[model samples]
Target chain A: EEELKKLLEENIKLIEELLEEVKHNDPELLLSVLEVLVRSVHVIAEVAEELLERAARLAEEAAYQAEEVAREARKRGNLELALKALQILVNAAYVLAEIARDRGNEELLQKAHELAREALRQVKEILEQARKEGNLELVIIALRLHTEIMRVLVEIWRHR
Target chain B: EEELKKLLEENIKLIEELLEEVKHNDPELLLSVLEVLVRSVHVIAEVAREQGNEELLERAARLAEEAAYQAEEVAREARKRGNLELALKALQILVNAAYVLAEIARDNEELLQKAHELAREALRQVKEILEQARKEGNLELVIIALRLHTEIMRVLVEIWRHR
Candidate 1:
């Protein structure tokens, strides 16, 4: 049992390390980390819940950090970077929203929805700016993100 | 009579200009044009029908049918070239046109079903692409797929919410 405990701890530690690296950037990594943590529940039930909670907290932190990045990017007149930051934030929001929904936490779900809606507004602004500048590429990117934010928001709404 | 005729001509011209610029890009523009054209038809049909103008209403309906075909053609071309952004623009036009067609042909269940199915199919395609992109970690494709999927879902939710 001691060896098994050590192995489980190492497994969780790896996920934590990966999450720290990915939470602000690579959404795919966050997804993989979530999947691993979920599977860990079957093996180390007691530790798993705490670990999941910690991960959720980190995700919320990451979301806020991304929001700040988006704002900074916009101030610097870098709409592309701003859009990228918003995407990361949206991705984290999706996971967080799902977690809230599963736990039946209405407050958390509302927060997630609000965050996503704010991001969607930024997306609309980007679209308008792109239109004014005649930047078809940016318009396409913004439109796509706008659609995604709406979709995720709806998913969150259904849970509510 | 001349005032209404001039208004109609201007609306068609604006739609034509939008359609021309939106052929290869700007899905949003296509959407805007379709909306304008549909609204124009609605107004024309209402006024002309009340004035006993069967010929005018029939012309308006034929214009909508042609718009549907043109929009579908754009979708096919976009699909062939694997330009999802353009494809989405075309698909959206197709969807808007479908709804307009159903409205024009009030008792046409077939048209309504076609519109619903197009939406479902577009949703499915975008979702599949998103999953594939997510698995492959192709950030560009992932972003595009997510955007299309989200937009499609928004439309679906609106339809369901109002239905």
Candidate 2:
């Protein structure tokens, strides 16, 4: 339990640091931070989902919070923040899925599936919207997100 | 002379295959092709430069230009298909081609200047793509772009250092 908390706290700090670095517009640093963030969240989800039942719920809550944050950013015309927020949520779902696989819990796996599938759907919708609007930036962003989702889905299936 | 001719013929076959794959809009195949082309040309340049074989050097320059042209076509096609990742790969080929051409033209100031400009312009456009990718929080795209940027810079420095 303590270990889980420590991991989560560490992840929160890393997330804070990334947001701070994002403002500086250093692409290299930002990318490094993102890699670390994804790995950290995955690790946390792995630990929390299996060891403590509450942690799984917490992960779900985190996903929800990320969705809210993404939606809010979209409203503000900050697609960058919005996309990052969705990425965070996707990672959270990935974590849940990994934990479910390890535990062999069908219920947990279903929840994970639903979350990940929704994320994929939303990303695809973004891509379709970008195509219609002819927004190159959004199209590129959506394309990348679509790739990431496919990768995560592959990971989930591999364990099964 | 026979050995050199054989190597150039082999490169031409690879280039032809790459251009054909580009027509089909296969980004993965195009990326693999670019890798092969970059490495193959560098080897050719090294041997030709060492032997002081002007004939081979000219052949290398022609091959590089052809690769550059095909890469441009790939970028245009990839954009139309909304495959920015492939487009980025095409730019990378362009960067490598420019560098190779620049090295080949080391003795000719005008040609060298033109090759350098091509490299510079290609790099600038690559940076712009990276910026947009970054803003979208597309870390994978950002990472690829940064890697290509770093690689091109390394090529430039190496050529300039020797010059």
Q: What is the lDDT of residue B54 in candidate 1?
A: 67
Q: Assess every candidate by TM-score.
A: 0.43, 0.47
Fraction of true contacts retained by every candidate, in order, equals 0.00, 0.00
**Which candidate ranks first by DockQ, i.e. highest?**
1
- DockQ score of candidate 1? 0.04
Clash pairs detected, candidate 2:
none
Error of 1 at A104 (Å): 16
Q: What is the docking quality class of candidate 2?
A: incorrect
Tens-place lDDT per residue, model 2, A8-123, is 45334534444455635553345344434444444333332343464455566566756766676668766666667677767877887876776678887778777778778877
Q: Write the per-residue lDDT of candidate 1 for residues A7-70, one digit (tens) a residue.
A: 3454445445544655566444444343333333223223326655765565676677678778
Show model 1 residue runs off by greater than 4 Å: A1-23, A26-66, A70-160, B13-65, B99-110, B125-137, B161-163
lDDT of 2 by residue, B1-163 (tens): 4786776777768676765767576666776676677667777788887777888777778777777776777777775787878888888888888888888887477657667666766666666776787788876565566556555554554445435
